[PDB]
Specification:
This is part of a larger assembly, with five copies of chain A.
Chain A: H1 2-8, H2 12-18, E1 36-44, E2 54-58, E3 65-75, E4 78-82, E5 95-96, H3 101-110, H4 123-142, H5 149-152, E6 164-166, H6 170-173, E7 175-182, E8 185-191, H7 192-202, H8 210-213, H9 220-227, E9 231-236, E10 249-250, E11 259-265, E12 272-274, E13 279-283, E14 296-306, H10 308-316, E15 320-333, E16 337-341, E17 347-356, H11 358-362, E18 378-385, E19 388-395, H12 396-407, E20 417-420, E21 435-436, E22 443-449, E23 461-476, E24 479-481
Parallel strand pairs in A: 5-12
Antiparallel strand pairs in A: 1-14, 2-11, 3-9, 3-10, 3-14, 4-13, 6-12, 7-8, 7-11, 15-23, 16-22, 17-20, 17-21, 17-23, 18-19, 18-22, 23-24
PDB class: virus
Keywords: cryo-EM, subtomogram averaging, EhV-201, enveloped virus, capsid, major capsid protein, composite map, virus
Entry title: Emiliania huxleyi virus 201 (EhV-201) asymmetrical unit of capsid proteins predicted by AlphaFold2 fitted into the cryo-EM density of EhV-201 virion composite map.
Chain lengths: 482, 482, 482, 50, 50
């Protein structure tokens, strides 16, 4: 009686929701689709792959569309030997944990707050004086309550043996820059720092790229274990056509253009960290000093094979694809107040920004975007259009956590900040907002950074700003162009 | 030959799926949208913000729609001083870890199972006797196999120094109640306990509110670290209009109504836990005793700016929005059998329920919904409509884990139970089932709780029941009303 | 001036995106639906439930559709007693940690690499010699750099007391096979190993089945704690009709067919692990030796009640549902090169494969798909159609991580490999690609496994291959059939 | 022990019953009543000047 | 006319009553509260002193 009465208890308001219902929950409807197949094919580079060099590949035409694209990287296992035991000790310098430049830079900021005879003190006494000076520095700069000295003395249990390892997220770090080219024109460009920021914000829970890029979430002991043997990494290249099947790049519609991936590789000296400064780093299998020619890479592409009728239709009329392109503003930082002039073009969906200390970069911690003592490097930021506040001054947590909560699949674990003009900037096919930067005379991101950011040992810290913008790729008569 | 043969190998069944295909995977189609912009604006409260008080803000009209809404809370850093060293030691009482009322309440239930001279025993002997009595209690009540005494002696390594910290998820705890008002009418009401339950069930992996609300997942050492300095929290207010862009609140259509957020704040005594009972809690920067006027809050609103044509269309005909409203049944528990009479109205989508021990509340652990010794407080529950079983007696795990698995984005880490009448209760725009409680003469949730729940030291434990219900918000002639 | 200028700054390209816009972000539209209700009902098996037996249930007709289906399993708490203290010590043998067959099998592979007097060595000296021989084995087989011996000596802190526990993910392990039958015909079949693989790949972040199936992510101490008391498990049965509301099984349209669930239960000897070989395992409450009749199970079904008009429409014309069926190829492995001949039928969406060592199975670690020493058991795999490479040789990481990244909600934590022909194999209602195996004369999965896989103590290791295929379920005149 | 469930309350209301002619007149035209409403400002005090 | 609350009445809780329509006008309104008598006992003599 009650359940039937609920179906009868309808009024004029229910008519807007349920009158002439076009859907039922109790019967499945499905759509028929055209026939297609997927094939993954691995392809060698057209030029030699080496650390610090640029390499390119011309993408083969082994199907009708191009869907997924992965850079397959093979890194050798690492071993170490004392320089005294080596017949040829001359190698490039690597970052070493016995010379922690990041810790030395952090100590340099607290030196003015050390009370007593620091120079003559025992090692254990120096560690105590540094921890007390950190409390005095943080009280003076941040009105922070002092932490117990014992809580600041975190011994990272480092192993009592010699090692070397590939840096955190080495699969991204290796790709300093990649360019997707069609007919000799650059269609899009991605950077190592952008790839990491995109994975932090858009990386879905349970599908994080951890193993696929050599990322351990800053657990040095896991990087050491992984680096003792050969590593095979599959780094996704997040081009517009890899984001949705309807954006797959129509190879058949671009028949008269070569499709190329160009990759600028990281220098070998930046890719490795060692336990001690006096160690030589060896290729684990070959027992020779590690060299720039030990980088191996290939391109793994997923092709789509279409039925003849769909292939012929796509060849006759591929039309236009909405694309997202990436733009970059890279700046050196030498002061706590920084203004970035964002000379980006087109309808910008969103931008990302973050800072890297010089000391973190020099320590080989390339994706450590933290400030001094691991703090947030940004105090506040403001966004100006033509000297008018588009976003008034907001604290770092608003740009990092509130913007990520509103617009992104994930909150970043590092100090990555974002701002979206789009309601759904991760939707590759549905435009949901933008600001046209080609119609603004000035776009300025004004930053107030933490105290002493870009001073002394951190002179030439880096500001990264990346923007995502809409453009249109047009296919006509076997040619493709922006 | 094989791939072409697959495209030809079609029969009368494939016609229902693929005949006259209206979609292709090999060409992207996109829709054009109207022009809009988003702006985040921070606004001060209209009244003073203080602990234990009620404060309100009249929301400014700085755009055409209202989308996201965050309560920006600023909490001072905490320090502690001995009461003997303080010129004015008189402060409100705070929960203290040297007086663990929750542990004392748990011990009180096992006192009848202690064999031997408990009163005269050494401290280490008392801990042994309590662990043995816990085994005897659990064997007698639950037919549990005894755990090794050493496995029950979990020392939480508490630091050997003085501290105070803000309670777990302080950003939610501060909001005892918030009311969204339009034209003086309450449109919706949210509670601290509901906000926490909603984040447990609907909080997406990689987008949990942890840092944004001061939640550490019950790691006291992280709460201590965070509480030594100023904290800025961004607490999302999950109103119907924050859930989907098409539900954004049409400011232009409600021109003659004031929009107000009212917030009832938690008492300061409930917000802080200290290491010892004899400590005074100080504002870390100001070096004065912490007081009710040290709470700071503001409202961060995201406005939408529309193109004139869409703004004019929305002003002429905003029509009606489907809304979800929240209802609450709050009850004291003094017996293991509890019947809650759910006097909720309208088409209910779902309800949540959970229990809080008096001892957990008094210990300042406001979101600890566990029973005695951290067990599940519910043994079983039944749902009755007009004295007829709508859901027959089911064990706690069915209401907690099976309902969450079927209808929610996440399973709760705490003892939160749910039941959905909707197939998709997290879809804000598509009704997918409900029960109309305004047409039921009685709705009863009958609970069988664990033994001794609501007895002795847990007299006046709390039952929370929250329901989500459909209603319609109508916009007409510059006015808005339910 | 700027925001209005952006709305005016439109060209011929914007016309494809925004001309005649059929959607606005500033007004919600909702659809009305038909009236329905959901009811969860628990039902006993028609036959006795026992370990190692087959049991069936005839599903009741308590609503118009069948939606969710859970196997509710009740397992007793476990206790242990010495065999010498037991009046009837005769019980089935259980796996025991004092006789770690998996560790003994791993040691057997490194015996040829032990230098010195192993037989006469002290226990601590034998552990050192085994760790050194592991380095020599891994250097010889994999060109691995040696790990420090201290890093290989992981003591799992096992408790110094007697225990027994239910094996990891016992809720899946109990279900050796389940068959969904309609009118005496098997519509679909699921296996324990498939259920685990499906949860690894398709299990969403924050909705993992951990507690609902007794899974701890290989933390033996948590399995021990859980196994001391009665456990209630709710194992989801992932039939086609449980995946989407429009696929709910139309009970009213199948009126003349009995609907049955058949379950083949695991043997009791395979379900329990004990600390020591000389222990008897007891039912914790009854204080009797655990026996095959101590398994209890029931079926929890969610029924849908429809409004009379929708019920009558569905009875008159339920038509056809697209279904996914599961197929299995199970093979013994006795060599490092394995070819699996996949005699699957119909349009296959995707397949999963994985290996289990005999030693892992014999140790009671039924979902440990790792190789020797916890390594990846697959070096490479190739997929052939009619002796032509459909997927050329790819390394294990491509089949495990790249395929999961492209097509699945999650990456597997175990050595589960997949390959999809579908763009969205987790979409139950939208076909997005397949390969028709009923039109291929041969489908071969060629595997190169790790060295010594399937040799000596691992003779008769297992290869599992599971495929998901499309079929059509037809409803006509009160009957249902494939 | 005294507990939160020991509070008992009910509402005692005085109703007025009207003659049919006055009831019908009031139903047809009750019009408007002047009302007094109450408003509150609640503040914490920590100084001699407020 | 005396009327019970629609929800449970308890200390520290919120309770509501829907006023019945037992006449044409509503005039006086009194909250009828019933409080139990109090006694005291030493905490040492009490089986549940909490």
């Amino acid at each position: 009686a009650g359940s039937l009465t609920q179906l009868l208890a309808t009024g004029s308001m229910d008519a807007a929701l349920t009158q002439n219902a076009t859907r039922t929950f109790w019967k499945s409807s499905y759509q028929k689709h055209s026939l297609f197949a997927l094939e993954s094919i691995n392809q060698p580079f057209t030029t030699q792959v080496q650390f610090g060099a640029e390499s390119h590949i011309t993408v083969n035409r082994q199907g009708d569309l191009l869907s997924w694209m992965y850079l397959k990287i093979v890194l050798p296992g690492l071993k170490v030997q004392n320089q005294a035991d080596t017949v040829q000790p001359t190698q490039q310098s690597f970052a070493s944990l016995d010379n922690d430049v990041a810790a030395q830079a952090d100590v340099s900021h607290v030196l003015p707050y050390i009370e007593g005879a620091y120079t003559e003190a025992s090692l254990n006494t120096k560690e105590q004086l540094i921890a007390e000076a950190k409390n005095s520095y943080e009280a003076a700069k941040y009105n922070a309550a002092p932490l117990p000295v014992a809580a600041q003395m975190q011994s990272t249990e480092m192993p009592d043996f010699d090692y070397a390892y590939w840096t955190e997220a080495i699969g991204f770090h290796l790709i300093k820059r990649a360019e997707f080219k069609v007919g000799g024109a650059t269609i899009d460009t991605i950077w190592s720092e952008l790839l990491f920021a995109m994975e932090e914000l858009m990386g879905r829970a349970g599908r994080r790229l951890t193993e696929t890029i050599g990322r351990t979430l800053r657990r040095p002991t896991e990087l050491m274990k992984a680096s003792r043997q050969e590593q095979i990494l599959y780094v996704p290249l997040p081009w517009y056509f890899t984001k949705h099947p309807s954006l797959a790049f129509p190879l058949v519609a671009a028949t008269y253009h070569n499709i190329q991936l160009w990759v600028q590789w990281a220098q070998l000296n930046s890719c490795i960290i060692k336990s001690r400064s006096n160690l030589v780093v060896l290729h684990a299998e070959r027992n020779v000093p590690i060299s720039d020619d030990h980088l191996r890479a290939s391109l793994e592409c997923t092709y789509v094979h279409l039925e003849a009728a769909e292939r012929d239709a796509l060849t006759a009329n591929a039309g236009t694809q909405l694309i997202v392109q990436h733009q970059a503003h890279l700046q050196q930082v030498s002061s706590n107040n920084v203004t970035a002039r964002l000379n980006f073009n087109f309808p910008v969906l969103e931008f990302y920004y973050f800072l890297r200390r010089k000391a973190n970069k020099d320590a080989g911690d390339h994706f450590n975007f933290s400030g001094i003592g691991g703090r947030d490097p940004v105090v506040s930021a403001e966004l100006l259009f033509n000297n008018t506040a588009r976003v008034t001054q907001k604290p770092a947590v608003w740009w990092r956590a509130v913007q990520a909560l509103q617009f992104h699949s994930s909150a970043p674990l590092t100090n990555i900040y974002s701002y979206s003009f789009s309601l759904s900037p991760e939707d590759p096919i549905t435009p949901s907002g933008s600001a046209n930067f080609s119609r603004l005379d000035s776009v300025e991101l004004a930053l107030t950074l933490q105290d002493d950011f870009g001073a002394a040992h951190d002179a030439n810290s880096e500001l990264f700003v990346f923007a995502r913008s809409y453009n249109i790729l047009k296919f006509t008569n076997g040619l493709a162009g922006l």
